[PDB]
Enzyme design. Sequence first.
Site, mmCIF file in Angstrom:
data_model
loop_
_atom_site.group_PDB
_atom_site.id
_atom_site.type_symbol
_atom_site.label_atom_id
_atom_site.label_comp_id
_atom_site.label_asym_id
_atom_site.label_seq_id
_atom_site.Cartn_x
_atom_site.Cartn_y
_atom_site.Cartn_z
ATOM 1 N N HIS A 575 0.822 -1.204 0.000
ATOM 2 C CA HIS A 575 0.000 0.000 0.000
ATOM 3 C C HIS A 575 0.859 1.259 0.000
ATOM 4 C CE1 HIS A 575 -2.993 -2.813 2.224
ATOM 5 N NE2 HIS A 575 -3.098 -2.961 0.916
HETATM 6 C C1 LIG Z 1 -0.421 -7.943 -3.940
HETATM 7 C C2 LIG Z 1 -1.204 -6.670 -3.760
HETATM 8 C C3 LIG Z 1 -2.392 -6.694 -3.036
HETATM 9 C C4 LIG Z 1 -3.139 -5.534 -2.848
HETATM 10 N N1 LIG Z 1 -4.316 -5.610 -2.124
HETATM 11 C C5 LIG Z 1 -5.006 -4.518 -1.961
HETATM 12 C C6 LIG Z 1 -6.238 -4.596 -1.200
HETATM 13 O O1 LIG Z 1 -6.704 -5.608 -0.681
HETATM 14 N N2 LIG Z 1 -6.894 -3.392 -1.083
HETATM 15 C C7 LIG Z 1 -6.480 -2.185 -1.614
HETATM 16 O O2 LIG Z 1 -7.175 -1.183 -1.426
HETATM 17 N N3 LIG Z 1 -5.320 -2.122 -2.328
HETATM 18 C C8 LIG Z 1 -4.631 -3.232 -2.487
HETATM 19 N N4 LIG Z 1 -3.470 -3.175 -3.213
HETATM 20 C C9 LIG Z 1 -3.039 -1.877 -3.748
HETATM 21 C C10 LIG Z 1 -3.742 -1.481 -5.040
HETATM 22 O O3 LIG Z 1 -3.624 -2.526 -6.004
HETATM 23 C C11 LIG Z 1 -3.091 -0.211 -5.585
HETATM 24 O O4 LIG Z 1 -2.803 0.656 -4.496
HETATM 25 C C12 LIG Z 1 -3.924 0.559 -6.607
HETATM 26 O O5 LIG Z 1 -4.007 -0.195 -7.816
HETATM 27 C C13 LIG Z 1 -3.354 1.934 -6.885
HETATM 28 O O6 LIG Z 1 -3.225 2.111 -8.310
HETATM 29 P P1 LIG Z 1 -2.174 3.112 -8.916
HETATM 30 O O7 LIG Z 1 -2.597 3.596 -10.306
HETATM 31 O O8 LIG Z 1 -1.898 4.180 -7.948
HETATM 32 O O9 LIG Z 1 -0.898 2.202 -9.092
HETATM 33 P P2 LIG Z 1 -0.807 0.984 -10.103
HETATM 34 O O10 LIG Z 1 -2.118 0.310 -10.202
HETATM 35 O O11 LIG Z 1 0.332 0.083 -9.640
HETATM 36 O O12 LIG Z 1 -0.425 1.659 -11.462
HETATM 37 C C14 LIG Z 1 0.702 1.195 -12.234
HETATM 38 C C15 LIG Z 1 0.325 1.135 -13.692
HETATM 39 O O13 LIG Z 1 1.262 1.920 -14.465
HETATM 40 C C16 LIG Z 1 1.942 1.091 -15.389
HETATM 41 N N5 LIG Z 1 3.334 1.523 -15.458
HETATM 42 C C17 LIG Z 1 4.246 1.545 -14.436
HETATM 43 N N6 LIG Z 1 5.432 1.982 -14.786
HETATM 44 C C18 LIG Z 1 5.291 2.266 -16.135
HETATM 45 C C19 LIG Z 1 6.188 2.764 -17.099
HETATM 46 N N7 LIG Z 1 7.461 3.079 -16.840
HETATM 47 N N8 LIG Z 1 5.728 2.931 -18.358
HETATM 48 C C20 LIG Z 1 4.459 2.619 -18.624
HETATM 49 N N9 LIG Z 1 3.523 2.143 -17.801
HETATM 50 C C21 LIG Z 1 4.004 1.988 -16.563
HETATM 51 C C22 LIG Z 1 1.754 -0.341 -14.898
HETATM 52 O O14 LIG Z 1 1.812 -1.252 -15.988
HETATM 53 C C23 LIG Z 1 0.347 -0.261 -14.304
HETATM 54 O O15 LIG Z 1 -0.650 -0.396 -15.308
HETATM 55 C C24 LIG Z 1 -2.686 -4.330 -3.407
HETATM 56 C C25 LIG Z 1 -1.501 -4.301 -4.131
HETATM 57 C C26 LIG Z 1 -0.755 -5.461 -4.315
HETATM 58 C C27 LIG Z 1 0.525 -5.402 -5.106
#
Ligand SMILES: Cc1cc2nc3c(=O)[nH]c(=O)nc-3n(C[C@H](O)[C@H](O)[C@H](O)COP(=O)(O)OP(=O)(O)OC[C@H]3O[C@@H](n4cnc5c(N)ncnc54)[C@H](O)[C@@H]3O)c2cc1C
Lengths: 649, 649
Positions: A575
């Site tokens: 997280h």
């Molecule tokens: C194992 C696990 C379990 C989890 N369980 C929970 C839960 O129970 N409850 C909860 O609320 N949250 C949970 N989370 C957290 C939740 O999945 C994330 O906090 C949420 O998806 C936030 O999304 P984000 O866009 O901020 O980050 P992300 O979803 O990680 O966004 C990253 C995205 O950007 C892309 N990307 C990254 N770097 C690059 C680059 N250089 N070039 C192009 N594309 C790129 C990736 O391919 C991906 O599509 C969990 C996470 C994990 C890993």
Amino acid sequence: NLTGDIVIIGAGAAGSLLAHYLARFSNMKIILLEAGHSHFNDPVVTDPMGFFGKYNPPNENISMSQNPSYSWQGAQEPNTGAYGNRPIIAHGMGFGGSTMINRLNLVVGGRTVFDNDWPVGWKYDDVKNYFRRVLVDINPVRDNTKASITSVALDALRIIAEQQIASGEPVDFLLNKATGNVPNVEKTTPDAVPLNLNDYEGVNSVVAFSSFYMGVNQLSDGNYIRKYAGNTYLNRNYVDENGRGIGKFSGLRVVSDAVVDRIIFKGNRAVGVNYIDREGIMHYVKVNKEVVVTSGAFYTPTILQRSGIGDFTYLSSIGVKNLVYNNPLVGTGLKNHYSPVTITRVHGEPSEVSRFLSNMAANPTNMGFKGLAELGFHRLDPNKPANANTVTYRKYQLMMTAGVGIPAEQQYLSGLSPSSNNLFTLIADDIRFAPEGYIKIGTPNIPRDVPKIFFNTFVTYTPTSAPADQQWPIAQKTLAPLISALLGYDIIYQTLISMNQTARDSGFQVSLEMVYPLNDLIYKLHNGLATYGANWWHYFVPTLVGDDTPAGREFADTLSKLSYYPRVGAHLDSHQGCSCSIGRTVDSNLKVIGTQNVRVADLSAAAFPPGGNTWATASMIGARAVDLILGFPYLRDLPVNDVPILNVN
Amino acid sequence: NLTGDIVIIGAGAAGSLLAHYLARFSNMKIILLEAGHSHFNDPVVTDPMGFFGKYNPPNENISMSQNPSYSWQGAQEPNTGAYGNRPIIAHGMGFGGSTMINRLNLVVGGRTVFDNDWPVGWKYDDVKNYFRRVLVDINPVRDNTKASITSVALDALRIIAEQQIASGEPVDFLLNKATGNVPNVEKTTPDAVPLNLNDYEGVNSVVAFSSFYMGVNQLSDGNYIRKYAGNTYLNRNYVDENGRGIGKFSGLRVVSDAVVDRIIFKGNRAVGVNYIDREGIMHYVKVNKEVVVTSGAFYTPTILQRSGIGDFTYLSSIGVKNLVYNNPLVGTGLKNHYSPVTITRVHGEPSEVSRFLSNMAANPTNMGFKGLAELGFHRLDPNKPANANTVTYRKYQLMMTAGVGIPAEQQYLSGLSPSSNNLFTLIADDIRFAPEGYIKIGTPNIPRDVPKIFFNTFVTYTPTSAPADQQWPIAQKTLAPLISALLGYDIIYQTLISMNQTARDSGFQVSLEMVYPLNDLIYKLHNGLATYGANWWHYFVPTLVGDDTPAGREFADTLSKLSYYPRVGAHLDSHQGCSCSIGRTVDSNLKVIGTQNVRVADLSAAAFPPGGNTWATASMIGARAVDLILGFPYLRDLPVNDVPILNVN
Ligand SMILES: Cc1cc2nc3c(=O)[nH]c(=O)nc-3n(C[C@H](O)[C@H](O)[C@H](O)COP(=O)(O)OP(=O)(O)OC[C@H]3O[C@@H](n4cnc5c(N)ncnc54)[C@H](O)[C@@H]3O)c2cc1C
Ligand SMILES: Cc1cc2nc3c(=O)[nH]c(=O)nc-3n(C[C@H](O)[C@H](O)[C@H](O)COP(=O)(O)OP(=O)(O)OC[C@H]3O[C@@H](n4cnc5c(N)ncnc54)[C@H](O)[C@@H]3O)c2cc1C
């Protein structure tokens, strides 16, 4: 070449929502670039039980978080507070982002955190209408089966809450101001009403419940499907196999399998983006209006730095040629959660203990989460906010799971084999975790899975040749996580003590005790707390408070022994966030300080970690970015009965 | 643009030598592509003591192996034999490869390995000249400060060797076939002649000595320098600051800060190479005759695989577009060394014990290594080659060091702090380590720090429903590493037992008793070995043996408890190799099977790991590839007096 007005990097929990609701309400070209590709036909991700290793080869029995073909592998530098361990924390790769590989839980965060810990313009009354939209778009479900342990735990918590209310202490872990003197614990009658913890008005801040909410949808056949961002906002109804929109969505264009490295600048304005396809060919994307980066907590600061936004001295040291702006704060201040674990044994005849722990298996409806409560500050914790006695905060997220959650090494060391059938798991999560870190890049050539991540959890404090009185504030600030973890252990102990009598009352002739945390140590810690009160934590530094008494040495030794378990007998949650928060790198309009037309709209731009799981907050940030970019509150005024339609294949 | 005749990828321990001598002896344009830059003016690498962290900032105290700016972070998949942890292994990045961040310990490898484990054309008589060339080019030195317990240990080993010779066993860990009946233990006389373990004729296959050979050179000022491949063959005498050759080496051209991803083919023949520079612009390099890949054990198979050489099914599944030649053996058979660690405590009065463990501190000449011997097979080892009755083999490398080398978690658990001044370390490194693994890539986009690395070392055995008579061979094959570790512990115990009497005879009045591996368990192991003879290992599976006496139960318990230590109380060596070995990926002339004009000239192309450290072997592979590519024995016939000139600044 490809030309468009808005370019979005990373189709995560926020990028997908942003692209969807930005292509729907406008008429400008939109390009979304994602590192991975779609997984709609992959049984490992769509099936909720694919998370637990249901479709994996016998010789490659690893989860999706440990698979380089599903997620990045962000190794961190050695932890000075955990015997120099280097845990791996992952970010998903492909459509849906990290929500493609998560536990599908949904927690909103509460009202107190947003009201008190977030800046002006991002208070609860300004974000609740986006929380509601995210929740109604996901459409989670509750638990169907129900075990007898939940009722016993709820009744024990009710008795504890009554005792705490009668005691009259200003602050405790089972008090809520918005309710009054009535404990906020669900009823145990068969015809009871559930207590929702994601209430619209945020009345429930410290609430004991019976079920969580999982992001799954029942299918017409009879099986379940995983409801996440990828199939909710970027399914076949809106996006076809060529990455193009259909009908109204024809403006949006999605590029798959495209990793980006730099943003091209003309001095203060983004004018292009470069990426690499599956054949190693470098492509260039023209930018007309704006660029939004949503690459996640770990990889947004890196792409900002290698483009020329950060500390000029270090960037010139590593060898960055083009520099734009000087922010020594980019990538600093990264927060996360932590969850120590506990194991409990049940005594009695085999038949009664088999009837006691029944109906607590895992199904796509609960994912092993029985769910107990969200708890507040322990009365003995010295580190509280200024107005903690007026408004109630969230600190602990209590959880209950079957089996034993313990690394195999500790399973062997303790002798608690998972093959036993009389053990269950209680976890006291910490959602106000104090340690902070930072992120820096190592090589300015291409994106890399492992940048420099520094994150020290449980450090020790060294005495100095000064009077103890002025040294005590430094020790109090330094030793916060240890105190929080030990107080969580004490909370679990009190819960078990009450639950013994509660279960004996309910008709089960069983007894309970802690086994993994070495029950003797827990009992001694409870006695020491009861006999020392507020100044109990002064024994973490026995040199400055030397008693020269057997009781003092005993308490110091017990405290030194208990400090070992949270370092190893626990695990890190994925997280992470707040690395590029508002007020350091960006303003209240999510615009990078020092530039013209680039924005960050992911969890990295969060001012403070929400009080619980972090899926909904990133989607809220994206939804707010939608009508900040457009300028008209379309999503805040969108009818609730308007939700995207689901296409499975 | 850039055009050339031979393109070398990676300036490691072999690419540097190959490029140097290939530019010297020829008249064709040569391009070297490296992912790092020279560190000739960096005190962390040039000073030999910088390996231990002599110039590290207080808030970034990390070794070069753990620094992303100095090395690639090769995270691996969980090890099912060590409670599912993921150790991190690195390759150095810069001029000199992994020799820039290593311990500078030079071991030739031996003769029996090259005589019984390598194909025809790669025997010892065909590689001894190249070994000599590498050794004279590096020009190592021996330890200057002789300690006192080295003589005590050598006398104890002499007593053990005398006993073993007088006994009459066909094989044991102190018998050398090419020395007769005289023990091969170095003399303790004040003017004793040294025993060289890298001798030209390879007669010392089981030899006990007093000092290793390490690559440091003493400057006229007085302080020492690190003499590795980078400054040996790529100093300012030959390559200028821009990257062009000087004088006779005018055909060379070195490109720094360049990471490669593809090799462009024309159906069966390479025609170009692609790389990305610091600025982030893709560049193309033409090839006229040959391409040589020397990117290391981990990252050469990845470059081959994403170029279109490997298993067609997996490559097409993961999205690789262009496929050239099908070969499912690429990236298989990975080997490495494993070193369990043992701690000993000395008893006696403070003065005598203080003077007993004196003159054993680490200095730039011995780097904390005192060195004991290259031991042989234990007499009770059941899994040994049939040739052992005629020739002698290297299986154990014995080293000693001051202090305690133990992970901090085990340091706390065992109660052996590093602050004690009466402890030293004995390490029995296994150099015939049995397990093997494989490497796969995850995404066909860019080079990545973490590909899929599978390496399971201490896997246990599960009995089946079959008679024991045919079950025994499979269990014997499966349980080899645990047997080797326990036999190493027994060897150390015997050495300590002899050392006690030797020290009491030599003047000191002290007692040595092993502590960390729980001496009582080792005593029980020794007694059980003596009682049960050759079939001691049958008790790893107490159900299948059928023994039910209390003695059998006790022995089974001791064997079960002792197996815990090797899994956690040790660390994996960074001597990985043999992933593109001869006869499976390349022929005897190092050309890749199925292709026309590419070759691999690094440690990955080794048929069998040598008996010791692996720097010299990689340099030898490069040196041999020099004259295979050129077609004339230039390096084999070069006079020994012709060596490169050092140029520090
Ligand atoms: C194992 C696990 C379990 C989890 N369980 C929970 C839960 O129970 N409850 C909860 O609320 N949250 C949970 N989370 C957290 C939740 O999945 C994330 O906090 C949420 O998806 C936030 O999304 P984000 O866009 O901020 O980050 P992300 O979803 O990680 O966004 C990253 C995205 O950007 C892309 N990307 C990254 N770097 C690059 C680059 N250089 N070039 C192009 N594309 C790129 C990736 O391919 C991906 O599509 C969990 C996470 C994990 C890993
Ligand atoms: C901490 C440590 C200690 C060691 N101690 C010893 C010791 O005491 N004795 C001993 O004999 N051995 C030791 N070794 C091992 C020894 O250093 C290596 O095995 C040896 O250098 C093998 O040479 P190589 O060329 O095969 O590998 P390397 O020298 O590591 O070759 C890697 C080279 O390829 C380059 N490269 C890789 N991928 C790419 C790419 N995609 N594009 C461009 N360039 C690329 C890298 O930049 C680097 O220059 C140690 C290793 C480590 C990590």
